[PDB]
CSV table of C-alpha atoms and ligand atoms in Angstrom, one decimal:
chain,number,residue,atom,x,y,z
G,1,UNK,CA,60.8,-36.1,26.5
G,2,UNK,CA,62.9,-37.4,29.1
G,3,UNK,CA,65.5,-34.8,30.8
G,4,UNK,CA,68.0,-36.1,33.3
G,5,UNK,CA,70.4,-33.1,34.0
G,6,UNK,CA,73.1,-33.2,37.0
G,7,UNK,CA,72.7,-30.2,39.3
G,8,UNK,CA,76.1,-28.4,40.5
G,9,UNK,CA,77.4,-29.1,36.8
G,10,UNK,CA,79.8,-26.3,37.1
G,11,UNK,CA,81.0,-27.3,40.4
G,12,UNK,CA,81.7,-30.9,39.2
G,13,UNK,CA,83.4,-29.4,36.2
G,14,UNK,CA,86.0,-27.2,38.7
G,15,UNK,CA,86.9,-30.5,40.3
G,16,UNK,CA,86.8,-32.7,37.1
G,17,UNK,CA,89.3,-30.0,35.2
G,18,UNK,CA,92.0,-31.3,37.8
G,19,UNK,CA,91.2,-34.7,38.1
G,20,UNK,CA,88.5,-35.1,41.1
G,21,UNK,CA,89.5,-37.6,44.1
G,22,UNK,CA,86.9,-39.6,46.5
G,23,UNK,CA,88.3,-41.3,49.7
G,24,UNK,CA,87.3,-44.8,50.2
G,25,UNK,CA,87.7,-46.4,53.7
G,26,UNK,CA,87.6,-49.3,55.5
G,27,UNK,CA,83.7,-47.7,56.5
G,28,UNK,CA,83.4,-45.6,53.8
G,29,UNK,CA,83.0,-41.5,53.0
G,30,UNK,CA,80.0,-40.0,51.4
G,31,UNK,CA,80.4,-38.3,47.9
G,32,UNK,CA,82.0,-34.7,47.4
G,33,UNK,CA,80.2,-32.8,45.1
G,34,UNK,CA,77.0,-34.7,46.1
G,35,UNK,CA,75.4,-36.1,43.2
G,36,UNK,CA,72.0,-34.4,42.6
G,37,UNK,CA,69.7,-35.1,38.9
G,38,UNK,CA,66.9,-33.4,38.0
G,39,UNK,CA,64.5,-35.0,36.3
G,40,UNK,CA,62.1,-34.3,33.9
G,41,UNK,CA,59.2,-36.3,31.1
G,42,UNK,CA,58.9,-39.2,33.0
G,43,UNK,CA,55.3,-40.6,33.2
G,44,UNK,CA,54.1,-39.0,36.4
G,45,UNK,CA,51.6,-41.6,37.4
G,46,UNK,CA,54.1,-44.8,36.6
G,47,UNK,CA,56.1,-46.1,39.2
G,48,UNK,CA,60.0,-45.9,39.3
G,49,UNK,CA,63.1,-47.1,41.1
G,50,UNK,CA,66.4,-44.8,41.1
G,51,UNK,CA,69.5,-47.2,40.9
G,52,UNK,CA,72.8,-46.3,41.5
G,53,UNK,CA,76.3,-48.3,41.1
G,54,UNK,CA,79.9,-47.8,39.6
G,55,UNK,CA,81.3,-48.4,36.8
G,56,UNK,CA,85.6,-48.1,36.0
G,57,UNK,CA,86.4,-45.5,33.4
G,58,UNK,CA,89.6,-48.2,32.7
G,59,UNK,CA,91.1,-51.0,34.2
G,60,UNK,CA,94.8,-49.3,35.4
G,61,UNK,CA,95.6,-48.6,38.5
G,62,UNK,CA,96.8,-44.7,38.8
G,63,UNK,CA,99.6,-42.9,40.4
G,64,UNK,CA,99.8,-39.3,41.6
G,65,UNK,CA,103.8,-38.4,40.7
G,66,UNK,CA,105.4,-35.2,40.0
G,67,UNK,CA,102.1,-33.6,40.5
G,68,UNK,CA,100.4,-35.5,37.6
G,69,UNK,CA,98.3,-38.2,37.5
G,70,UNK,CA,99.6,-41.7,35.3
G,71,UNK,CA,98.4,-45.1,34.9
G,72,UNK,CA,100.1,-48.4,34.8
G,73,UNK,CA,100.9,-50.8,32.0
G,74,UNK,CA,99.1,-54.1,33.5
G,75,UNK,CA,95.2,-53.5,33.8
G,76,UNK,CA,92.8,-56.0,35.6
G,77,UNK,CA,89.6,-56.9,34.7
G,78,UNK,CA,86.8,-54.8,37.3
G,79,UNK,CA,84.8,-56.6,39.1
G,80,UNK,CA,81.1,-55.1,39.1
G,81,UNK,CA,79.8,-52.4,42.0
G,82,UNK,CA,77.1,-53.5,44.4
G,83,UNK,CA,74.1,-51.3,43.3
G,84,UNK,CA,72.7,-48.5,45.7
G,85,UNK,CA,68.6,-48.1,45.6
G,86,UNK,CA,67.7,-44.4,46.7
G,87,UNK,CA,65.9,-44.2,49.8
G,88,UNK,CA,62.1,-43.0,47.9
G,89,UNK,CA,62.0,-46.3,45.8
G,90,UNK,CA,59.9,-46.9,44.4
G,91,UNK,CA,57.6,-43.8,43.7
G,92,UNK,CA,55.6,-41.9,41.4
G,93,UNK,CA,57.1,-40.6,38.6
G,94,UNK,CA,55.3,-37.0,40.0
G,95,UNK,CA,58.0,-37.5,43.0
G,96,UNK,CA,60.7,-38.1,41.2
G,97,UNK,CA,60.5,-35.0,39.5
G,98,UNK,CA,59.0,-33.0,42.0
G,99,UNK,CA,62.6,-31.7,43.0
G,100,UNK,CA,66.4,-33.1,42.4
G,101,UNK,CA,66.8,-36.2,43.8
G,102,UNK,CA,69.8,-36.7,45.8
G,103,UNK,CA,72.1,-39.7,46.3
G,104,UNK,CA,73.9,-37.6,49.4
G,105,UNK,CA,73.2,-41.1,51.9
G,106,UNK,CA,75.8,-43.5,49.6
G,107,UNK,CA,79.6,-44.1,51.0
G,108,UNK,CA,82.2,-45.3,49.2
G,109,UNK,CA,84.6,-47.3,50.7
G,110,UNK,CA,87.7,-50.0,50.3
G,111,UNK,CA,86.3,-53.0,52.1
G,112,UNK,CA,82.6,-52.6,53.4
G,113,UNK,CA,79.9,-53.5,50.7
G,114,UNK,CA,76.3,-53.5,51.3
G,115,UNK,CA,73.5,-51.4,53.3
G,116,UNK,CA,74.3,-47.8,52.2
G,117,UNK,CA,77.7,-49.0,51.1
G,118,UNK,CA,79.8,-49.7,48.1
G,119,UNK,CA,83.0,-51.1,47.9
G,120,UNK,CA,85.5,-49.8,45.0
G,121,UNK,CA,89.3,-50.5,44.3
G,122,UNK,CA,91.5,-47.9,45.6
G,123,UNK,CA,93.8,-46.2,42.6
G,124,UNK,CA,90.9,-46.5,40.4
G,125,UNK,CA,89.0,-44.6,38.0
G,126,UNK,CA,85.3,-44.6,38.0
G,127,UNK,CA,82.0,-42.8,37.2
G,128,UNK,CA,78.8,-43.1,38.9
G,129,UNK,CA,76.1,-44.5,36.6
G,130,UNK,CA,72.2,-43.9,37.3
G,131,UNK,CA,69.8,-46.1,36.4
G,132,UNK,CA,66.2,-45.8,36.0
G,133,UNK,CA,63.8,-48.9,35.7
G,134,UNK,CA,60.4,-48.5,35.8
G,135,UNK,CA,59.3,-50.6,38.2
G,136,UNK,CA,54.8,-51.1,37.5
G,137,UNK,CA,53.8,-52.2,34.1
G,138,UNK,CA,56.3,-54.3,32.0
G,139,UNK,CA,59.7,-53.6,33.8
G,140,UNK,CA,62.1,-52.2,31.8
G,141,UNK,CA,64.6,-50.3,32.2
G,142,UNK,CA,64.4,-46.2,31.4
G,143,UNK,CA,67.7,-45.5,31.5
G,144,UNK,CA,71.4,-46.3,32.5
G,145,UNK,CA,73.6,-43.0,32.2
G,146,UNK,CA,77.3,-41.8,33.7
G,147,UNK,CA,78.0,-38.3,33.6
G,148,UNK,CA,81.2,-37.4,32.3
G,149,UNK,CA,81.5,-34.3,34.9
G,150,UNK,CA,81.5,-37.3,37.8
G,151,UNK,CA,84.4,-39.3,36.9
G,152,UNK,CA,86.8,-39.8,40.0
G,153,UNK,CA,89.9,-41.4,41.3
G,154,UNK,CA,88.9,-43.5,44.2
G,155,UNK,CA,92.0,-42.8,46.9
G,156,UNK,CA,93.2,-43.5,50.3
G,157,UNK,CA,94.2,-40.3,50.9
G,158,UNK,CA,93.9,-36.8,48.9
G,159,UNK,CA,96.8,-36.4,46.4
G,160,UNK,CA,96.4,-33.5,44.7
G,161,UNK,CA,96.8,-30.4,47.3
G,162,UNK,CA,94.7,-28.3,44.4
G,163,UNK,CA,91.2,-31.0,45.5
G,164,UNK,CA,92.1,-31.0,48.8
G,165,UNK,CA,91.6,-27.2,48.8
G,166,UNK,CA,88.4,-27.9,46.6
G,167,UNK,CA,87.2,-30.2,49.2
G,168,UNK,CA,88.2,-28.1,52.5
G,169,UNK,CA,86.1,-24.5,50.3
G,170,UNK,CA,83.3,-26.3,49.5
G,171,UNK,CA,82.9,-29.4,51.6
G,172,UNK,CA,82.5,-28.5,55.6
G,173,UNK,CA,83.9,-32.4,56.5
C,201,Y3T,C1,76.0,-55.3,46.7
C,201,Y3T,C2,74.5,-55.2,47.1
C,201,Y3T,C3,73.6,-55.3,45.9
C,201,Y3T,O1,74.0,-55.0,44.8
C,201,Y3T,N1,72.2,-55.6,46.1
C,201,Y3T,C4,71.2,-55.7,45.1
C,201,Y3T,C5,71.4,-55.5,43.8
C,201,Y3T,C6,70.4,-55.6,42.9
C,201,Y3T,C7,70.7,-55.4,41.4
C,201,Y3T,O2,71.7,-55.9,40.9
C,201,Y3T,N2,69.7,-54.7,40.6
C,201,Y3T,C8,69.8,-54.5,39.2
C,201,Y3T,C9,71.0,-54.4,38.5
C,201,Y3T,C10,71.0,-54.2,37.1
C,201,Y3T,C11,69.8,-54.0,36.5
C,201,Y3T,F1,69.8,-53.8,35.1
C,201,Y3T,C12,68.6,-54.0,37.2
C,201,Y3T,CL1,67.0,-53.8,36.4
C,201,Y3T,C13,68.6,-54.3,38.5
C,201,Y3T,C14,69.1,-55.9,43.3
C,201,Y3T,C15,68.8,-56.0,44.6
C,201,Y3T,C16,69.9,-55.9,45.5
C,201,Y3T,O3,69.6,-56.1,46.9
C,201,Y3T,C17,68.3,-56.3,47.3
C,201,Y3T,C18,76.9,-56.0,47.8
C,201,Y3T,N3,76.8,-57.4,47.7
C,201,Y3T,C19,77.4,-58.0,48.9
C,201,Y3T,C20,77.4,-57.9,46.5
């Protein structure tokens, strides 16, 4: 049966429990913790591509006061993420669970959109979503799933002293 587990759960979890942040730039900034799946009960021999985009937990915009984070009373309607293709598509279903696969190459930022980069609204909340899609035989797609350890606030700058400690321990950037 198909498996799809997030690797560094626990670690996710420690910056989750105080509301994780991800800076977005004008550039971009790759993910902090990275996110890693393993994989397992795919058909090895079909072929498979590994998706990747963003989808908002809500539509407020967020603000860090008084050391807590709050939304606002007017939400917006989201516009969709561009969609990140890990570099190995498309392969065997043998690579894909030959060992974690890693989306460490994808920068999110405030502006730039395209070619390794994805643009999301600053004072946001999202999760990554994976998708596979099976990519030989009739297409379809395998699966679409966020994890619930991954949701983030994208930011211009770290509010929370408590993640920017996180980040500066377990982060060398
Ligand atoms: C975004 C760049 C971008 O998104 N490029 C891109 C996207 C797709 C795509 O949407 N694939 C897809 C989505 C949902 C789904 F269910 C399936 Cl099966 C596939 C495909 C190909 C792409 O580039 C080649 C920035 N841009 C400026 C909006």
């Amino acid at each position: 049966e198909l498996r799809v587990g997030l690797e560094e759960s626990e670690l996710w979890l420690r910056f989750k429990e105080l509301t994780n942040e991800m800076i977005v730039t004008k550039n971009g900034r790759r993910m902090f913790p990275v996110l890693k799946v393993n994989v397992s009960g795919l058909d090895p021999n079909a072929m498979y591509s590994f998706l990747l985009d963003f989808v908002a937990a809500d539509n407020h915009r967020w603000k860090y006061v008084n050391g807590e984070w709050v939304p606002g009373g007017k939400p917006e309607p989201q516009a969709p993420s561009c969609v990140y293709i890990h570099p190995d598509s498309p392969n065997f279903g043998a690579h894909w669970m030959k060992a974690p696969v890693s989306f460490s190459k994808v920068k999110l930022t405030n502006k730039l959109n395209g070619g390794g980069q994805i643009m999301l609204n600053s004072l946001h909340k999202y999760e990554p979503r994976i998708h596979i899609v099976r990519v030989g035989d009739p297409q379809r797609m395998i699966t679409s799933h966020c994890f619930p350890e991954t949701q983030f606030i994208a930011v211009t700058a770290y509010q929370n002293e408590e993640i920017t400690a996180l980040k500066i321990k377990y982060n060398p950037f």
